[PDB]
């Protein structure tokens, strides 16, 4: 670029403005980092229920499989008495991030219910029990995901402010300030000192020529 | 200090016609032309459109192509060194390619080899030929294919169903002139037929 | 006691007359543009300025017991809540925490009866500081971790 005073100006007022910025989408990246971790550890933590909740379905199952023998499956696949499995959605907002948020039948509204099995009052109890537990872990998956694209998006920009644009500005700054004070100022001077010698070489040219005479 | 602002540099370039400025960065890589082709600028290109149009109509052609693709590589460049080599359109894919051939294959030049000490006209038009017409058959994939997947996505594809073409367009440079001027015209048309026919095969293949 | 008046030109620190006059004094006390804009009479940037010999003011014998204290309590907190608003620009203040909102309403306070002095409201440095720990004792007597002890015990209770 030209160099000049306006724009030495103009790149110093650029170079702060980004380094405001940069500290800006630090914090932003942090918060959303902590949110993630956050969610991680809360999926790590319902990861167990997918085991517990597991466990108590498959108990109920033997129990209704040890009362009615074989389950009638087929029309109306049998094994439970709720989930007329129907999902709904909704957007939360957790730092900028659009984290979904995941409702649905035997967790949530759109759910029904009709007669049932022998145990079907138990593989409810078991069987659609693990229905609360798989949509917790299926929003907290989601979230986890957006999270995650979301800081990998941040992370990229905060990082390439600091190493690209930040490192690409100084050196501007400083070749700007290397050519106004580097060459116009000491131009100025000796513009300047070449006139005074001008000066006086004419002063001790009258001299001479008012003493030779 | 290499910047062009010098008062010397500044007036010569006020005068000057045709200016081959040099930068710094390509003689550090070992490229050895070290021409920055972003900045040099040649105000004979008009004069000699009566030798380009009596020598070869497609020159004046090519060369506003390549033009083009050096200019679309360096925003592409620019854009990358923030965005990420990711959610690139496979059209900028192919752009990108092709662009890498002809910097380190045609404007590349060792300057100290029995082939590159010296390389005639035709032979330049030749490798200019043979890279647009990868561009555009490239392109040409990239517009049609039977479904978007298998017209622009498949450069991956190609880098292996074509590999060989693609290394000999690199390769081609490496043939010195002082073999047979018509030993190396004869290979480069029969390279250009080779590549012609196994591209034209693969989109007319599957698609 | 000299307090010259300088006026920096370009509105930058980097202009020989003030640069120069930097090194041979001991402090300074900028004038903020955008504290104007903001309709704020005196414009002091408090945070940017500051004496570089404010210590010998601040004693026993003069003035009152707790005034480093609360200067650097009320120095921190600004600092906090100019951080904390920048946050709420890009975090939607929907996520802040508690003290988040404390520090927010603090620099609000601040900003808009503490530093916004009228022309003619002489205040004597008792009163002075009487308003700084009205600001101060919004926050938790456990919060004021820049303040020492036994200072939170005499004053905090109003």
Partial sequence: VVPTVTMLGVMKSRLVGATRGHALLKKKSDALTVQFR????????????????????????????????????????????????????????????????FEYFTDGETKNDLTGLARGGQQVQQCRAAYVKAIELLVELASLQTSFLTLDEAIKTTNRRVNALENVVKPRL??????????????????????????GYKKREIERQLASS | ???????????????????????????????????????????????????????????????????????????????????????????????????????????????????????????????????????????????????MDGQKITYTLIKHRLGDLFYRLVSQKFEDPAEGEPALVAKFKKLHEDLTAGFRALEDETR | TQIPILTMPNDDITHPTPDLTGYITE?????????????????????????????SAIGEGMTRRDHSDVSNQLYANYAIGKDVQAMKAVVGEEALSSEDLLYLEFLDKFERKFVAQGAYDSRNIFQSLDLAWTLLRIFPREL????????????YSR
Wanted: one cysteine or more; a neutral charge; hydrophobic letters at 40%.
């Fill in chain 1, 38 to 101: 956050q969610i991680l550890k809360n999926i790590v933590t319902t990861k167990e229920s997918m085991g517990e909740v597991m466990k108590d379905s498959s108990f109920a199952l033997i129990e209704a499989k040890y009362v009615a023998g074989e389950n009638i499956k087929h029309i109306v696949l049998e094994n439970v008495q709720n989930a007329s499995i129907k999902v709904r959605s909704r957007q939360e907002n957790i730092a900028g991030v659009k984290i979904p948020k």
């Fill in chain 1, 174 to 199: 400083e070749n700007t300030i290397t050519y106004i004070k580097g060459e116009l100022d000491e131009l100025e001077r000796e513009d300047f000192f070449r006139l005074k010698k001008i000066q």
């Fill in chain 2, 1 to 147: 200090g290499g910047d062009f602002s010098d008062p010397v540099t500044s007036a010569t370039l006020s005068i000057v016609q045709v200016f081959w400025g040099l930068d710094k960065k390509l003689a550090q890589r070992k490229h050895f032309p070290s021409v920055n082709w972003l900045i040099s600028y040649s105000k004979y290109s008009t004069a000699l459109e009566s030798f380009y149009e009596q020598f070869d109509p497609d020159f004046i052609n090519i060369r506003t192509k390549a033009r083009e693709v050096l200019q679309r590589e360096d925003d592409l460049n620019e854009i990358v060194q923030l965005v990420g080599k990711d959610a690139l359109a496979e059209g900028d894919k192919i752009t990108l390619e092709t662009a890498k051939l002809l910097r380190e294959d045609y404007l590349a030049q060792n300057a100290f080899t029995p082939y590159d000490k010296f390389c005639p006209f035709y032979k330049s038009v030749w490798m200019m030929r043979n890279i647009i017409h990868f561009y555009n058959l490239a392109n040409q994939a990239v517009e049609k294919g039977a479904g």
């Fill in chain 3, 27 to 55: 402090g300074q006390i900028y004038i903020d543009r955008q504290l104007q804009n903001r309709q704020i009479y005196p414009p002091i940037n408090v945070l940017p300025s500051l004496s570089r010999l404010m210590k």
């Fill in chain 3, 144 to 155: 004021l971790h820049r303040i020492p002890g036994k200072t939170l015990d005499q004053y």
